[PDB]
Amino acid sequence: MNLCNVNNYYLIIAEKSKAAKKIAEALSEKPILCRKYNVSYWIIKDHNSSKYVIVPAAGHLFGLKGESGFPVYDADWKPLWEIDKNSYYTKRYYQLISSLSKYALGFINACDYDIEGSVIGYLIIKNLGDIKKAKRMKFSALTKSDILSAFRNISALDYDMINAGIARHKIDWLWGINVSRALMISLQDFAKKRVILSAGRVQSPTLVQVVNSEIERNLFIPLPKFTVSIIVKIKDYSLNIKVNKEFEKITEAKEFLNKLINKTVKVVEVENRVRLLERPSPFNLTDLQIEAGRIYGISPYNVERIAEDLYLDGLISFPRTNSQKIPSTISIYNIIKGLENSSYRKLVDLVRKITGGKYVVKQGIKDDPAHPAIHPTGEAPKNLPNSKFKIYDLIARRFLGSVSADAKLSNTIYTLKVSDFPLEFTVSYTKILERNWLDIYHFHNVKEDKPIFLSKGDEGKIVDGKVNISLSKPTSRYTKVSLLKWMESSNLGTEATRGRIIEILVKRKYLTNNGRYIIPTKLGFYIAEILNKFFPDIVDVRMTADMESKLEMIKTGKVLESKVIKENIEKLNKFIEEYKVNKDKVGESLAKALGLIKIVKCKYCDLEQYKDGLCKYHYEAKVRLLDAVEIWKERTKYDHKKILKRISSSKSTGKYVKDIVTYMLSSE
Numbered sequence: 131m132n133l134c135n136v137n138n139y140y141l142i143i144a145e146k147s148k149a150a151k152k153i154a155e156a157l158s159e160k161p162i163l164c165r166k167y168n169v170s171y172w173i174i175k176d177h178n179s180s181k182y183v184i185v186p187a188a189g190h191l192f193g194l195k196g197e198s199g200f201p202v203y204d205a206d207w208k209p210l211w212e213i214d215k216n217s218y219y220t221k222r223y224y225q226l227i228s229s230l231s232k233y234a235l236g237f238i239n240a241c242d243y244d245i246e247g248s249v250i251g252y253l254i255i256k257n258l259g260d261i262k263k264a265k266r267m268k269f270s271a272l273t274k275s276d277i278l279s280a281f282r283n284i285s286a287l288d289y290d291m292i293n294a295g296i297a298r299h300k301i302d303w304l305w306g307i308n309v310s311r312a313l314m315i316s317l318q319d320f321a322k323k324r325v326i327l328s329a330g331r332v333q334s335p336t337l338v339q340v341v342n343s344e345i346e347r348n349l350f351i352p353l354p355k356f357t358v359s360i361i362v363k364i365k366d367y368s369l370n371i372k373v374n375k376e377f378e379k380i381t382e383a384k385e386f387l388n389k390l391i392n393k394t395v396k397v398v399e400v401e402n403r404v405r406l407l408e409r410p411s412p413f414n415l416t417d418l419q420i421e422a423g424r425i426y427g428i429s430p431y432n433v434e435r436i437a438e439d440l441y442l443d444g445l446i447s448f449p450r451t452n453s454q455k456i457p458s459t460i461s462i463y464n465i466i467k468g469l470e471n472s473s474y475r476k477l478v479d480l481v482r483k484i485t486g487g488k489y490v491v492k493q494g495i496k497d498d499p500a501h502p503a504i505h506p507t508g509e510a511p512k513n514l515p516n517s518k519f520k521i522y523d524l525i526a527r528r529f530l531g532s533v534s535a536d537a538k539l540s541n542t543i544y545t546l547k548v549s550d551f552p553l554e555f556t557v558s559y560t561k562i563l564e565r566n567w568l569d570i571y572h573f574h575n576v577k578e579d580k581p582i583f584l585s586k587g588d589e590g591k592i593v594d595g596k597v598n599i600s601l602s603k604p605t606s607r608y609t610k611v612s613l614l615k616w617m618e619s620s621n622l623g624t625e626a627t628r629g630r631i632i633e634i635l636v637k638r639k640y641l642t643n644n645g646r647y648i649i650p651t652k653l654g655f656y657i658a659e660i661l662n663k664f665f666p667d668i669v670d671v672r673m674t675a676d677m678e679s680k681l682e683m684i685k686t687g688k689v690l691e692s693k694v695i696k697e698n699i700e701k702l703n704k705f706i707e708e709y710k711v712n713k714d715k716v717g718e719s720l721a722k723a724l725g726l727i728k729i730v731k732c733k734y735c736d737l738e739q740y741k742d743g744l745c746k747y748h749y750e751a752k753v754r755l756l757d758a759v760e761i762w763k764e765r766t767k768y769d770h771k772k773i774l775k776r777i778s779s780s781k782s783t784g785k786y787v788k789d790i791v792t793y794m795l796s797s798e
């Protein structure tokens with residue numbers, strides 16, 4: 131008897147070794163571990179009358195190959211070991227599957243339940259097996275019951291889903307290859323040096339967004355306004371109140387403050403109310419990335435990778451989802467009972483106490499009807515490495531928080547009417563009455579104020595106060611989380627790809643990490659400006675989202691993949707035309723960028739001068755400065771030197787402006 135000898139079997143293709151193992155244990159109490167080409171795979175002789183072999187793909191086994199040089203109109207699937215030397219290790223997975231496929235009765239794609247898994251399984255079965263004998267397992271968690279359920283409900287492959295993923299891969303590859311070679315070729319022909327440059331259908335509009343926002347930030351000048359704070363003596367309290375009215379000119383604010391001193395104020399309304407602070411909804415992937423970035427500093431790409439690992443451990447549901455809902459087809463009770471039998475037992479006892487034993491998900495807005503929100507399966511976490519445990523604990527507490535109870539806050543608002551004036555201002559304080567979910571998803575601080583006890587009709591006096599200057603503020607620099615939110619909001623990429631695009635931008639050195647903020651490098655800056663200057667259509671956020679909408683329509687059967695491919699060729703042909711025209715200037719710009727041809731540098735940076743010895747950005751900085759100073763003068767009456775000092779001292783002031791300002795203060 132040969133343990134690993136089998137015939138007349140269905141071949142089940144899984145994406146990862148852990149998923150293959152999980153599927154084997156779902157199908158048999160004694161699955162057989164085999165090894166060939168140094169790859170572990172599983173034989174199921176036990177399940178019903180049929181036999182099964184479960185093999186991991188390890189990831190993509192196929193990649194796109196096209197023409198060399200520029201332009202590239204074609205993209206065809208080839209084994210990755212043949213076309214990508216960083217992927218020759220996959221050859222052994224390719225060999226195993228090809229060997230097991232010849233003697234197979236049929237094929238089951240059990241890759242992950244997203245578009246990538248549909249493509250991976252399709253390419254493998256189509257090329258190594260028989261596509262006409264192909265079925266799809268669609269599961270959202272690697273629990274025995276979810277796997278068995280999907281095995282029982284095996285369906286045809288979803289060719290519309292497959293075509294949507296193929297279309298996105300081919301269109302992404304075609305745009306990246308063509309634009310990146312067009313850039314490198316224009317430099318080779320103009321400076322005779324070859325440097326590696328990259329571009330992407332989503333990377334490039336993303337880099338342009340960041341560069342444009344960094345320019346705007348670097349040209350920002352805080353403008354002044356004035357606020358009035360008053361001190362109200364009423365009963366035993368001394369209340370510092372910031373008045374809700376703002377003033378452009380300092381004289382209007384002084385006027386306003388002085389007519390309030392020594393006036394009487396009367397409590398004319400008291401409002402005591404209990405406010406709800408709703409328990410959170412279960413994570414979709416973006417929400418998880420956002421929260422794990424804020425709390426632990428884990429990058430979006432790593433959050434997704436870690437969540438995928440936890441799903442492969444059977445600990446959470448599949449994390450590539452937009453949904454913030456848990457439908458009734460998911461047993462909350464089973465999850466809760468699982469967590470009760472784990473290190474989360476005491477947290478579950480607390481949720482039981484908070485709810486009385488009634489566990490109701492606070493359903494979020496976003497849906498994804500085939501892909502529920504991220505939640506724990508109820509299987510017990512054990513021995514989790516550090517970053518894994520942080521992510522699992524986030525997901526578990528978010529879920530447990532979502533089935534607990536809304537928090538309650540007591541609010542008291544006093545309305546105070548000034549004597550002789552049509553003006554009334556408020557004093558308010560909030561206290562936590564019931565913490566509830568705040569003790570479960572304990573990552574949300576609630577500001578509490580010391581109580582203030584006043585009755586309707588109580589009177590006091592405004593005894594003192596101050597006019598205070600308030601400087602306008604720049605839009606914040608991007609964080610990874612903040613950039614990721616912009617991508618989601620603009621519908622660039624998918625929630626599965628956005629985190630990787632951000633990481634690819636850093637790896638290829640167009641972006642860099644300055645603390646929590648992600649800023650351009652010089653190279654990223656130049657590439658963004660070049661793409662902006664010469665190829666605005668390919669970095670237009672609206673047109674990128676347009677393409678995203680067409681890709682989404684392939685999934686529904688509403689548009690043909692072949693039609694999106696044709697339309698993309700049309701777009702490439704338009705890029706080709708624009709490239710022939712501008713190629714020499716594109717190459718010249720790239721040359722200046724890397725110091726390859728000497729330029730007359732700006733007085734304050736390395737960019738090429740534009741006017742007055744200033745680059746285009748420092749020149750705009752000066753224009754903005756002159757106008758901002760005028761606004762400062764009209765509003766504050768400060769003299770020139772003092773306005774400059776106040777702009778120079780504010781960290782809101784862009785660096786281009788700050789260069790100009792420091793110069794003018796150094797002048798004589």
Ligand SMILES: [Zn+2]
Nearest residue numbers: 732735745748
């Ligand atoms: Zn400059």
